[PDB]
Design a protein around this ligand. Structure first.
Ligand SMILES: NC(=O)C1=CN([C@@H]2O[C@H](COP(=O)(O)OP(=O)(O)OC[C@H]3O[C@@H](n4cnc5c(N)ncnc54)[C@H](OP(=O)(O)O)[C@@H]3O)[C@@H](O)[C@H]2O)C=CC1
Ligand code: SF4
Ligand code: SF4
Ligand SMILES: [Zn+2]
Lengths: 292, 114, 96, 126, 95, 176, 208, 123
């Protein structure tokens, strides 16, 4: 480790920690809250974007004086990715649009994007490349989303095999998507078991995985301890809400399952306290008119 | 040191005024946590109130106990009004970690610390 | 300047102020900048042969405070300062 | 109105609201800032300075400045005695280490001692 | 003039040019690491050191109040040129 | 001498009361106010058009914080640190080094433009007039990093103009 | 001497010495020091048990109106038995004279809150309660002024340092402003400026 | 005319003091007030940035900057030369918002200089 990479002082706001983070994605939800905790930790975050600079201005007040830095890339080139991973201590891969644009399918994003970036990450000699994945990403049918993420898991396990694959369950938070669709109403009767996981325990597990070794190679899972039914969750979310570009891959996901795998360790083995969904659901169940 | 008093002549009215303060804080929690639209149960806020009373166990002098009662009464004025806000009440809570350690081993690895 | 006489007559007709005379357009009344440089002399000093700093050392004459009472048939009771006599009315148009 | 006295210290250490690590761990030092030897004159003496122990100053990762996590680094409390220093330190709460005051011992010196018929002080150049 | 570090970039006039694994280089991504290509030492080599016939001479720097205060340097030793502390230009004598 | 106002009784003459009644009915000096509004309506405005007709200034204006160097010579600063000693917001950060020949010069020269309060005390204290308050004002930045300056930034900023600064000092050297 | 030295007054100095001696005689109960400096402004220095009596006597008695108040300040000095110094500063309307009324106190013993004779001192007393801690008995409202609500410490002390123990920033984790232990970005390089060689020989206390 | 009709507003050519390299035009009048003595017309593509539209301040050279902010009374074609040779003659103009702008870095060498691990191994 080079000089001025060593940690210093109390935490946060110029605490030059032992990581130099390079985050892919982060214009959306989970990567933005991850950069939020990194600026709480006080490291330098290299993040690219191909979007309008609003969200990267939005995450500007996060780090300290001139810490975070921004660049550009696209799903065509190699030079910009290499320029992003020129000098990176740790590097994470969040990517994926939940609907089909006219040029990026569900195909070839999870196939073409983690291959090139993870390959040049191994070719940059980085340590602890982390890649996300959904829970129960199976080759089994009725899930384009999960089978493409399973192909992504296969590619990341093929090139640089000791990369940290992280799989949580569905993530409830402050700007959630599936729980927004739960709230997005105005007659249907079904059932499928399901348990979600809270976003800040997820990202505390992420930073513990990114700075606590013995973690590489073996994939990790992050599930909340709920383990109940979809119908009870619909009753719960509508009792708290007090009410009486979308595809049906969404409804396939929320009627798939949430099954466990005892092969891999989780929350308590990695050492971060799991919080249930009660008061955070009270947070994220706003918009109602006069019951507060 | 025949000091002028503040409110109490001995520890009796000191304990009486601070238990009246704690009575007011117990009956002060639910109105404010329903009004200010917080994210926290009533029992957790009441437990931080009794924890903040538990912090000051070593306070002995009647001037100092009366001055703590004066600070608590001023803050209960500023919280029965909405001069303060949600930011201040969530600043009484310590939620955004800061998980800063106490073990000598963790004061040693994450070091330059006593 | 550089206006027609009809709107000048309207400006006088609107109020009796004679707006042609003083008009808030400073044309050449500003002194022409970059004059030859003027010298800046020195006043009651810098002559030789007498100007001791021993004489005019008002900084080092700050006296310690003079004290009266402490813990350590009188025709009297003056004021701290004399009662200043009441002022004068205005010469040029008071009310009244 | 002639209230009772007690043989106790003062307890403003929870009235001032300073955090607990800055209460306990800051071992103060009371010292006499002695004569700056490259200068001359002891005008800067006679003032007991209570100051605090120093902690880390790390490199600012953009400019190399010394960013510190210390509120209590730049304090200097100016006193006149030692008993009042001990009284203030017991009054506000923390502990402390004490230097003495080491006045210059006056020595007998003379130009008529610099010269002598049968003593071995000889400048030989003046 | 700028030299060549092993990074393929412009070094500094004072030796702070980066190591090959400094991530300050990767916060210099895509923008000008600005440098003043005129260096200070590069002008002293083109200075004609003058030859004043006195012994201890003066230096002002081209008019009072535009430059540096009056400094007085010596021309005793013929093995060393008399260097001003402010001007940064030398002096010599002849006889 | 005092001149105290608002003391009148209303004059109860017939002519005075019919003039004041006509003022009440017709809103007469209200129409006089309208006349004043027209009298400023029919003027010509004293604006300036911004990029093409710039507003005037003064010779002693304090902008860019540039640096001068010698007439056909090197860096005018010595690192004598008077500008840090007089800089009130402590924006001057100087860590000197003597150079590779021996004459005392710098390494780390920093004017924290986020902290500078534009007095001119560094202009007063600078014994060689090395640091000079610049003439222009376009910092105007989309970032925070580009505000904080360094030695090579300030010397490139002083190499963009010299005779500007020399002209302002030659105008202003007798006074200050 | 004749230029460049500020000329002193004589008869005004005599009258203020006479008036201070007058007050010091006619109130034997609360008098410790009266003093006049070179620039001739009267100073009275008082034990803190007759504050409202001295201010009532210095509002009336008809040879001293002194109807205008200033500043109250309990100027913090260490090393003493009584740190805090209440400094009243009074101006008269019929007289053109200036007195300073300095009474002394320590960190906990209150004074009698002279708002009831000068209504100007209400917000002054609330402010100096917020900044020092000189508690004020028989006073209507002691709130906090010139400080944050959740902040405390009475920060004009010499114990509270220059930068605070608190810092505010924003997080989007809980969508609000949070506090932190302070993290300066610069050292605040403190300048040692204590010169030798006896800056003023006239003010030499007896050496210990 | 559409040049100056949609440049800003003016038609007031008629004094013709001069121009300067980058082509920019400088006109001084005495007939107007103090504030519209000296005005400037910006050319097109002076450094390839299509500066007919979106015109910047400090696309002017600095001698006309001193002349035009009303600090002198005579144009810099009254006194052309100066015997200083270190100055920029490229005039990298105002640049905040490009991929070519300033980044800060401390002109400071290594501080503590860590111990070198030995080249040859042992045992
Ligand atoms: N519980 C779980 O395990 C789940 C995990 N996830 C994963 O976690 C992350 C965040 O989840 P989510 O809220 O759904 O999504 P987000 O909106 O938060 O993040 C998706 C990111 O992918 C980027 N991206 C996608 N396609 C492209 C492309 N062609 N070129 C450039 N950037 C691209 C987006 O950039 P931009 O917006 O600028 O276009 C955005 O930054 C994702 O990586 C997702 O795969 C998702 C759902 C469930
Ligand atoms: S005052 Fe002038 S010469 Fe001295 S250090 Fe500052 S810039 Fe350099
Ligand atoms: S103008 Fe003032 S604040 Fe700015 S650098 Fe100079 S002394 Fe400091
Ligand atoms: Zn010289």
């Amino acid at each position: 480790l080079h000089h001025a990479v060593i940690p210093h002082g109390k935490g946060g706001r110029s605490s030059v920690s032992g990581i130099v983070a390079t985050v892919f994605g982060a214009t959306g939800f989970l990567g933005r809250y991850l950069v939020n905790h990194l600026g709480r930790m006080g490291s330098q975050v290299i993040v690219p974007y191909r979007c309008e600079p609003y969200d990267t201005m939005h995450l500007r007040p996060m780090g300290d004086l001139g810490q975070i830095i921004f660049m550009d890339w696209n799903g065509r080139d190699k030079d910009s990715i290499r320029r992003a991973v020129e000098h990176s201590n740790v590097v994470i891969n969040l990517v994926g649009r939940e609907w089909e644009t006219k040029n990026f399918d569900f195909e070839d994003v999870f196939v073409k994007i983690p291959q090139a970036i993870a390959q040049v990450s191994k070719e940059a000699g980085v340590e602890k490349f982390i890649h996300i994945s959904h829970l129960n990403a199976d080759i089994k049918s009725s899930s384009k989303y999960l089978r493409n993420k399973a192909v992504g898991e296969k590619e990341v396990r093929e090139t640089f095999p000791e990369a940290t694959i992280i799989k949580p369950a569905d993530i409830f938070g402050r700007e959630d998507r599936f729980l927004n669709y739960f709230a997005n109403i105005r007659s249907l009767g079904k059932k499928t078991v399901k348990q979600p996981v809270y976003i800040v325990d997820v990202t505390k597990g992420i930073i513990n995985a990114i700075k606590d070794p013995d973690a590489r190679g073996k994939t990790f899972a992050f599930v909340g301890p709920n383990r109940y039914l979809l119908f009870d969750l619909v009753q719960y979310v509508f009792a708290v809400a007090h009410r009486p570009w979308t595809t049906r891959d969404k409804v396939e996901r929320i009627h798939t399952t949430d099954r466990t795998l005892p092969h891999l360790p989780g929350l308590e083995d990695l050492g971060v306290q799991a919080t249930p969904l009660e008061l955070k659901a009270i947070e994220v169940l706003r918009r109602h008119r006069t019951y507060r | 040191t025949s000091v002028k008093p503040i409110f109490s002549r001995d520890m009796n009215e000191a304990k009486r005024r601070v238990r009246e303060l704690y009575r007011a804080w117990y009956r002060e929690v639910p109105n404010t946590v329903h009004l200010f639209q917080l994210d926290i149960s009533v029992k957790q806020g009441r437990d931080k109130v009794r924890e903040m009373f538990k912090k000051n166990a070593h306070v002995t002098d009647p001037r100092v106990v009366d001055l703590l009662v004066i600070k608590g009464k001023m803050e209960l004025e500023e919280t029965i009004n909405v001069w303060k806000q949600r930011t201040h009440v969530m600043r009484f809570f310590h939620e955004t970690e800061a998980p800063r350690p106490k073990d000598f081993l963790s004061k040693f690895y994450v070091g330059h610390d006593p | 300047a550089s206006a027609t006489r009809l709107i000048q007559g309207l400006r006088n007709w609107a109020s009796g102020r004679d707006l042609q005379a003083k008009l808030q357009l400073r044309y050449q009344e500003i002194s022409k900048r970059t004059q030859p440089p003027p010298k800046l002399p020195v006043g009651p000093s810098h002559r030789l042969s007498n100007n001791y700093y021993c004489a005019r050392d008002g900084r080092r004459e700050a006296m310690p405070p003079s004290i009266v009472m402490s813990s350590q048939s009188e025709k009297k009771a003056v004021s701290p300062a004399p009662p200043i006599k009441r002022w004068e009315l205005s010469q040029d148009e008071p009310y009244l | 109105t002639q209230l009772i006295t007690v043989d106790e210290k003062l307890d403003i250490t929870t009235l001032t609201g300073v955090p607990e690590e800055h209460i306990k761990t800051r071992k103060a030092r009371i010292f006499v800032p002695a004569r700056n030897n490259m200068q001359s004159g002891v005008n800067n003496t006679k003032k007991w300075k209570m100051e605090f122990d120093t902690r880390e100053r790390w490199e600012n990762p953009l400019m190399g400045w010394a960013s510190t996590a210390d509120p209590l680094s730049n304090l200097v409390l100016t006193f006149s005695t030692k008993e009042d220093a001990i009284a203030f330190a017991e009054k506000n709460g923390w502990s402390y280490d004490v230097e003495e005051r080491k006045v210059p011992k006056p020595k007998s010196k003379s130009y008529g001692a610099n010269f002598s018929w049968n003593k071995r002080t000889r400048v030989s150049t003046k | 003039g700028v030299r060549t570090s092993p990074t393929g970039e412009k070094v500094t006039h004072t030796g702070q040019v980066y190591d090959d694994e400094d991530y300050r280089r990767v916060r210099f991504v895509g923008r000008q690491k600005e440098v003043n290509e005129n260096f200070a030492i590069d002008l002293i080599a083109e200075q004609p050191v003058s030859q004043v016939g006195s012994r201890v001479i003066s230096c002002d720097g081209g008019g009072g109040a535009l430059g540096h205060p009056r400094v007085y340097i010596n021309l005793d030793k013929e093995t060393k040129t008399g260097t001003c502390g402010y001007c940064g230009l030398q002096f010599r004598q002849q006889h | 001498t005092y001149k105290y106002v608002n003391l009148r009784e209303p004059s109860m003459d017939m002519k005075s009361v019919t003039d004041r009644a006509a003022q009440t009915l017709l809103w007469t000096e209200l129409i006089r106010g309208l006349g004043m509004t027209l009298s400023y309506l029919f003027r010509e405005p004293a604006t300036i058009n911004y990029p093409f007709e710039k507003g005037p200034l003064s010779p002693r204006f304090r902008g860019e914080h540039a640096l001068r160097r010698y007439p056909s010579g090197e860096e005018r600063c010595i690192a004598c640190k008077l500008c840090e000693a007089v800089c009130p917001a402590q924006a001057i950060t100087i860590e000197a080094e003597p150079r590779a020949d021996g004459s005392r010069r710098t390494t780390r020269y920093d004017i924290d433009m986020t902290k500078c309060i534009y007095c001119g005390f560094c202009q007063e204290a600078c014994p060689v007039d090395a640091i000079v308050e610049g003439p222009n004002f376009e910092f105007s930045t989309e970032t925070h990093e580009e505000l904080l300056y360094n030695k090579e930034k300030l010397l490139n900023n002083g190499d963009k103009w010299e005779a500007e600064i020399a002209a302002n000092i030659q105008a202003d050297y007798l006074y200050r | 001497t004749r230029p460049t030295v500020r000329p002193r007054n004589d008869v005004a100095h005599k009258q203020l010495s006479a008036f201070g001696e007058y007050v010091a005689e006619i109130l034997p109960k609360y008098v410790q020091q009266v003093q006049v400096s070179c620039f001739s402004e009267l100073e009275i220095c008082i034990h803190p048990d007759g504050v409202i009596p001295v201010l009532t006597f210095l509002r009336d008695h008809s040879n001293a109106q002194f109807k205008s108040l200033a500043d109250l300040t309990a100027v913090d000095i260490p090393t003493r038995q009584n740190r805090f110094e209440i400094v009243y500063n009074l101006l008269s309307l019929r007289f053109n004279s200036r007195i300073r009324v300095k009474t002394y106190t320590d960190e906990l013993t209150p004074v009698e809150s002279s708002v009831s004779v000068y209504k100007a001192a209400n917000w002054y007393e609330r402010e100096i309660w917020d900044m020092f801690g000189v508690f004020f008995a028989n006073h209507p409202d002691l709130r906090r002024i010139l400080t944050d609500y959740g902040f405390e410490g009475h920060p004009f002390r010499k114990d509270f340092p220059l930068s605070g123990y608190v810092e505010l920033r924003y997080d989007d984790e809980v969508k609000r402003v949070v506090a932190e232990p302070v993290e300066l970005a610069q050292e605040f390089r403190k300048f040692d400026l204590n010169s030798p060689w006896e800056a003023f020989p006239a003010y030499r206390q007896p050496p210990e | 005319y559409l040049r100056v009709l949609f440049r800003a507003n003016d038609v007031r050519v008629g004094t013709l003091v001069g121009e300067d390299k980058y082509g920019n035009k400088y006109y001084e009048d005495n007939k107007q007030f103090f504030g519209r003595h000296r005005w400037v017309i910006y050319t097109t593509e002076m450094n390839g940035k299509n500066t007919f539209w979106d015109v910047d301040g400090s696309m002017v050279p600095p001698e006309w900057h001193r002349w035009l902010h009303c600090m002198t009374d005579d144009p810099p074609t009254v006194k052309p030369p100066t015997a200083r040779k270190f100055i920029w003659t490229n005039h990298k103009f105002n640049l905040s918002g490009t991929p070519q702008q300033y980044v800060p870095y401390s002109t400071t060498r290594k501080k503590i200089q860590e111990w070198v691990p030995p080249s040859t191994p042992y045992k």
